[PDB]
């Protein structure tokens with residue numbers, strides 16, 4: 001299990017993550033004040049929505065505003081690359097720097113690190129995170145299609161081999177079969193290969209059941225929406241909690 | 251679609267069935283009065299819980315009490331055999347007679363008919379039902395294990411070939427894989443072979459997601475509990491409705 005800021009990820013009900021999206025420092029603050037009136041387990045800051053990413057200082061100041069608003073929340077720092085469905089382009093060097101500066105700031109509890117950034121850079125960044133008691137959600141997204149169950153399982157296995165604390169994969173179904181494929185990979189991963197918590201989701205309307213069935217098939221967390229979704233398929237956070245509770249207590 | 255007593259089965263959200271269980275005429279009445287203060291789509295009377303099954307008249311009087319309490323509800327008459335997880339033994343002849351008398355009484359809208367009763371008797375009973383504008387939920391249960399997806403699909407295909415209006419299968423998982431197998435059979439049936447609505451469920455705690463994911467994978471109805479479950483895995487009917495509504499509107 002990963003106990004991150006006094007949340008035990010990998011036990012009990014899947015943990016609810018919400019994504020804060022603000023274009024500037026003022027909107028980040030306003031969003032943090034609104035989010036702290038919702039109930040969820042982990043706050044993801046979607047850094048790629050922030051316009052002034054060119055300044056490491058500006059990014060760190062925004063992280064501090066969030067942390068000041070929610071002193072006790074598990075805080076996940078996520079720059080989603082345009083490659084993997086995020087809002088803007090960034091150089092590899094600047095991406096890694098933003099993450100390292102978030103790590104050594106003491107403001108964040110976890111970073112998201114995209115698997116396909118490159119093995120050497122991944123290893124260096126994972127080691128830096130761990131040296132500062134920061135956990136790594138190592139991630140992969142396919143916003144267009146669903147790989148085979150075999151491919152997804154090997155992808156998640158590689159994340160473990162590279163030191164991910166929590167492997168994560170989000171894929172887009174093009175069919176109902178694709179949703180079942182994602183559930184199948186999740187269960188195979190959890191039963192035969194995982195040695196740590198894993199997060200999986202099938203996106204869009206069609207994939208919604210994957211955001212609900214984490215407890216049965218082995219996804220440790222799931223994303224809900226406070227007002228606006230950060231990815232297709234996310235449902236209102238109160239409704240998500242209601243369903244997770246019903247499944248947990250059945 | 252099967253529109254039965256002004257309910258369109260096979261469209262929209264999966265329909266909620268609850269099972270009324272009473273040992274005698276007085277308890278059947280009391281249960282009917284309690285059930286009509288719950289919200290659901292179809293009332294199943296579990297005839298095999300009734301003690302005085304030896305008298306066709308007694309069974310018909312009980313059906314009338316239910317119908318008198320709920321004049322407009324779609325009413326499904328179900329004697330579940332001990333073979334398939336019901337409460338008591340019955341001869342084939344008496345089983346078929348109870349069903350035929352329920353059919354020609356005008357009191358019921360549907361009967362449950364177990365596939366493995368025997369082909370000739372199934373055909374005769376299906377024809378009798380249809381001659382009286384009664385629909386047939388043709389059913390199979392395995393309370394101990396989950397057949398292969400291939401076996402389940404061929405079983406449901408056979409039900410269609412024998413004139414079932416709604417094929418139905420309920421199986422017991424012995425693993426999480428078994429739950430996925432049931433979902434896989436459901437989706438394959440609905441996408442490649444069904445030409446009418448089908449009901450599927452994986453029983454027990456482990457199978458609960460199957461009672462929730464009918465809209466995505468192709469199960470037309472699902473069972474909830476008013477106070478007491480008629481089979482393992484059924485959840486409270488208000489909670490079931492809440493989840494189905496959340497999935498429908500996502």
Ligand SMILES: *C[C@@]1(O)C[C@@](O)(C(=O)O)C[C@@H](O)[C@@H]1O
Nearest residue numbers: 019078141170203223230231
């Ligand atoms: C992990 C993640 O990519 C997945 C997400 O795309 C989802 O589909 O919920 C939301 C996004 O904010 C998150 O970073």
Ligand SMILES: *C[C@@]1(O)C[C@@](O)(C(=O)O)C[C@@H](O)[C@@H]1O
Nearest residue numbers: 269328391420453473480481
């Ligand atoms: C259809 C049916 O056998 C299935 C059931 O066993 C279930 O698992 O919900 C309930 C039972 O009453 C019903 O007849």
Ligand SMILES: [Cl-]
Nearest residue numbers: 070071072073
């Ligand atoms: Cl807080």
Ligand SMILES: [Cl-]
Nearest residue numbers: 188191192427
């Ligand atoms: Cl397996």
Ligand SMILES: [Cl-]
Nearest residue numbers: 320321322323
């Ligand atoms: Cl009524």
Ligand SMILES: [Cl-]
Nearest residue numbers: 177438441442
């Ligand atoms: Cl298929």
Ligand code: NA
Nearest residue numbers: 097100101104
């Ligand atoms: Na550094």
Ligand code: NA
Nearest residue numbers: 157158160193
């Ligand atoms: Na491995």
Ligand code: NA
Nearest residue numbers: 347350351354
């Ligand atoms: Na007759």
Ligand code: NA
Nearest residue numbers: 407408410443
């Ligand atoms: Na067929």
